[PDB]
């Protein structure tokens, strides 16, 4: 069995290997990359996402989200308070202000220590989940707006044509902005490109160990667990690496820098934080290997998770027994 320790693997495809996206995902899986839940892909040196980032300041962040924490430094939840709209140029100025800027630090490990010590005492503002793309239309390789759609994959594998669309999302971050422990909708893959700015630190649990994380989360967030049998779908809970290690949960960590892709694999729980002002683009995708994970994905039906239009068909076709309850939670 390849990669039996479930380490995060880093790949360096050549320009020739960068042509066929599906083929390269299958290659990484042949080497056991999915066992980690997360992989890094460094693009060939010849490649670029677009010519420059000099003209992005007028993008609008319609609903910036202030991420307010509750709990203790290593075990906390966050809620999102909506703020007034602002442009990317306004948000970048805010991120660089004395109130929000990255503190002085020695290295990524020092900054990580400072994040876990101090995150809860601040409320950073995240420009998340903005429909759009920063890839040039002329970029033919690993262009996250030009991927095969998940609806087309389901149709190819299973023979059933479904409604829905699959487009990318932009994320504008600042120091301490945080992504809570989660798997993707329907336990899909994700791909994330860090277009510019400061790094993103990731934590990940191997897919084969995801239920260990879920059992710890039920213990640590006992009211939330009574409220919902899949409350990690709410995307609000944080658990630090120190707490994971104290409780014997297998995990790994890695820092993504500008110009690098990350792929999350089906049922790979992940969480993390941004180092400073940055912009990322991410989208969900599927492969044949995903179908069995889609069929078994948990679902929130309490009303909290609320998701896109396109998830309806995935539930309806892959999980018909669950459909009626889940749809009630959507309405
Ligand atoms: O970058 C972020 O805030 C969150 N991204 C992801 O969870 C992802 O790409 O799957
Ligand atoms: Mg602009
Ligand atoms: Ni994700
Ligand atoms: Zn729920």
DSSP-assigned states of every residue in 261-295: EEEEPTT-EEEEEESSSEEEEEEEE--TTHHHHHH
Q: Which residues contact 324 (CB under 8 A, 6 or more apart)?
A: none
H or E segment at 323? helix 320-330
Q: Which ligand is nearest to the CA of 326?
A: 4
Backbone angles phi, psi at 282, to 5 degrees: -145, 155
Strand pairing class (65-72; 75-82): antiparallel
Task: Please say whether the dihedral angle defined by the alpha carbons of residues 290, 233, 200 and 92, taken in this order, is positive or negative.
Answer: positive
Distance (Å) from CA 235 to ligand 3 centroid: 10
Are the beta carbons of 14 and 20 closer than 8 angstroms?
A: no
228 is in an annotated binding site: yes
Q: How many Cβ atoms from other residues are within 10 Å of residue 219's Cβ? A: 10
Distance CA 254, CA 202 (A): 5
Q: How far are the Cα atoms of 11, 48, 49, 150, 159 from residue 52, in angstroms, in the given order?
A: 25, 9, 9, 30, 42
- Select from 145, 138, 112, 143 the least CA-distant residue to 241: 112
B/e letters for 275-287, b = 16+ CB within 10 Å, e = fewer, are bbbbbbbbbbbbb
Q: How far are the Cα atoms of 31, 157, 188 from residue 289, in angstroms, in the given order?
A: 15, 10, 10
What is the CB < 6 Å shell around ligand 1?
171, 179, 190, 192, 264, 270, 280, 282
Say which experimental method was used: X-ray
Q: Is 189 helix (H, G, I), strand (E, B) or coil?
A: strand
Task: Please say whether the dihedral angle defined by the alpha carbons of residues 146, 255, 287 and 314, taken in this order, is positive or negative.
Answer: negative
Distance CA 295, CA 141 (A): 30
Strand pairing class (65-72; 9-11): unpaired
Distance (Å) from CA 231 to ligand 4 centroid: 5
Ligand 1, residue 190: give the atom nearest the CA: 10
**DSSP conformation letters of 87-152:** EHHHHHHHHTSTTTSPPP-SSHHHHHHHHHHHGGG---EEEEEEE---S-TT--SS-TTSSPPHHH
Supply angle C-alpha 150, 153, 155, rounded to 5.
110
H or E segment at 78? strand 75-82
Q: Which residues contact 2 (CB under 8 A, 6 or more apart)?
A: 30, 31, 32, 35
H or E segment at 320? helix 320-330
**Superfamily in which the 1-331 domain is placed by CATH:** Cupin (2.60.120.650)
Q: Which own/partner contact pairs does 208-215 have at CB distance under 8 Å and 24+ positions apart? A: 208/6, 208/35, 209/6, 209/249, 209/250, 210/183, 210/267, 210/268, 210/269, 212/248, 212/249, 212/250, 213/181, 213/244, 213/249, 213/251, 213/269
Task: Please say whether the dihedral angle defined by the alpha carbons of residues 220, 276, 49 and 56, taken in this order, is positive or negative.
Answer: positive
Please name the residue whose Cα sits nearest to atom 2 of ligand 1.
179
Distance (Å) from CA 275 to ligand 2 centroid: 23
Are the beta carbons of 130 and 61 closer than 8 angstroms?
A: yes
User: What's this structure's resolution in Å?
Assistant: 1.4
Going by the DSSP 8-state scheme, the letter that residue 15 receives in this structure is T
Are the beta carbons of 124 and 178 closer than 8 angstroms?
A: yes
Q: Helices then strands (H, E): number in the chain?
A: 10, 16
Listed by start position, the domains of the chain span 1-331
Ligand 1, residue 178: give the atom nearest the CA: 3
Ligand 1, residue 191: give the atom nearest the CA: 9
Distance CA 215, CA 34 (A): 22
């Amino acid at each position: 069995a390849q990669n039996p320790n479930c380490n995060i693997m880093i790949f360096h495809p050549t320009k020739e290997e960068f042509n066929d996206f599906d083929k390269y995902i299958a290659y990484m899986e042949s080497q056991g990359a999915h066992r980690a839940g997360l992989a890094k892909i460094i693009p060939p040196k010849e490649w670029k996402a677009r010519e420059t980032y000099d003209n992005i300041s007028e993008i609008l962040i319609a609903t910036p989200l202030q991420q307010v924490a509750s709990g203790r430094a290593g075990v906390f939840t966050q809620y999102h308070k909506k703020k007034k709209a602002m442009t990317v140029g306004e948000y970048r100025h805010l991120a660089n202000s004395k109130k929000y800027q990255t503190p002085p630090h020695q290295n990524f490990e020092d900054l990580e220590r400072k994040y876990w010590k101090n995150r809860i005492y601040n409320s950073p503002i995240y420009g998340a989940d903005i429909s759009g793309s920063l890839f040039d239309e002329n970029t033919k390789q690993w262009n996250l707006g030009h991927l095969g759609t998940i609806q087309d994959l389901l149709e190819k594998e299973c023979g059933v044509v479904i409604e829905g669309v699959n487009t990318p999302y932009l994320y504008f971050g600042m120091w301490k902005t945080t992504f809570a422990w989660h798997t993707e909708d329907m336990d899909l893959y994700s791909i994330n490109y860090l277009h510019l700015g400061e790094p993103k630190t990731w934590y990940v649990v191997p897919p084969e160990h995801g239920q260990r994380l879920e059992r710890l989360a039920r213990e640590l967030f006992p009211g939330s667990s009574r409220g919902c049998g899949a409350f990690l779908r709410h995307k609000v809970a944080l658990i630090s690496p120190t707490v994971l290690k104290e409780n014997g949960i297998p995990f790994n960590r890695i820092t993504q820098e500008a110009g690098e892709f990350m792929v999350t694999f089906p049922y790979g729980y992940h969480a993390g934080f941004n180092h400073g002002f940055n912009c990322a683009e991410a989208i969900n995708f599927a492969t044949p290997r995903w179908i069995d994970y889609g069929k078994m994905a948990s679902q929130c039906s309490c009303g909290e998770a609320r998701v896109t239009f396109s998830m309806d068909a995935f539930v309806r076709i892959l999980q018909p027994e669950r459909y009626d309850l889940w749809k009630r939670g959507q309405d």
